[PDB]
């Protein structure tokens, strides 16, 4: 009856580890988003790119600022970037390969979000 043992194992795993893990991850990311939007707003500067963090159904997500021709916006003009709320944003969930080190910048953005919050 090893199979019933495995069934019990996976049932306990899911409903006593993964679901509380989902709740804990949502709570931590929501707290980080709250501590981020309580002072900071719109985009912030990380690795010469611009990232913002928004909370959705499946956790927090970082979107990077790009111009019309899918080029990341240089940090120097974040001023006007805060003036224009219709600037193009690309999500970090999709691994888009045209930008060199896009996932690198996304990971550093998440790390900076953790450090600031």
């Amino acid at each position: 009856m090893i199979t019933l043992f495995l069934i019990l194992c996976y049932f306990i795993l899911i409903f006593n580890i993964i679901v509380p893990a989902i709740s804990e991850k949502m709570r931590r990311e929501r707290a980080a988003y709250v501590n981020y939007k309580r002072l900071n707003k719109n985009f912030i500067c990380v690795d010469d790119r611009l990232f913002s963090y928004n909370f959705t159904t499946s956790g927090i997500k970082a979107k990077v600022a790009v111009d019309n021709k899918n080029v990341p916006i240089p940090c120097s003009k974040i001023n006007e970037v805060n003036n224009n709320k219709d600037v193009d944003t690309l999500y970090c969930d999709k691994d888009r390969d045209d930008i060199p080190g896009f996932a690198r910048s996304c990971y550093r953005a998440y790390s900076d979000l953790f450090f600031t919050t």
């Binding site: 069934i7 996976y10 899911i14 956790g59 060199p100 996932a103």
Partner: protein
């Protein structure tokens, strides 16, 4: 009983769905090692100095395979007849690559 195996397969499938929906990025970072950013000086390590006639020359350039003359401070061509002796008194007769320079 095949029903028990079906149930445990449903267990592992729903575990995978839960991981993919929520913990996709975390597991992707932890278990899958991402490519490292290329090092331009690692590419430049193969470069070495020699003499193109009476001018300085850089062999072993993957950035530009064509013949290029080394630029001085004011971004102008370098033309010394004695540059070979200077290379011999610093690197040696053999053209020392930038990898050995970094290793120094």
């Amino acid at each position: 009983v095949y029903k028990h195996r079906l149930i445990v397969l449903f267990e592992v499938f729903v575990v995978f769905i839960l991981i993919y929906v929520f913990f996709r990025s975390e597991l992707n970072m932890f278990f899958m090692p991402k490519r490292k950013i290329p090092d331009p000086i690692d590419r430049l390590r193969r470069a070495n100095l020699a003499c193109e006639d009476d001018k300085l020359m850089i062999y072993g350039l993957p950035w530009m395979t064509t013949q290029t003359s080394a630029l001085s401070i004011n971004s102008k061509p370098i033309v010394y007849k004695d540059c070979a002796k200077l290379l011999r008194s610093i690197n040696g007769s053999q053209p020392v690559s930038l990898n050995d320079v970094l290793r120094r």
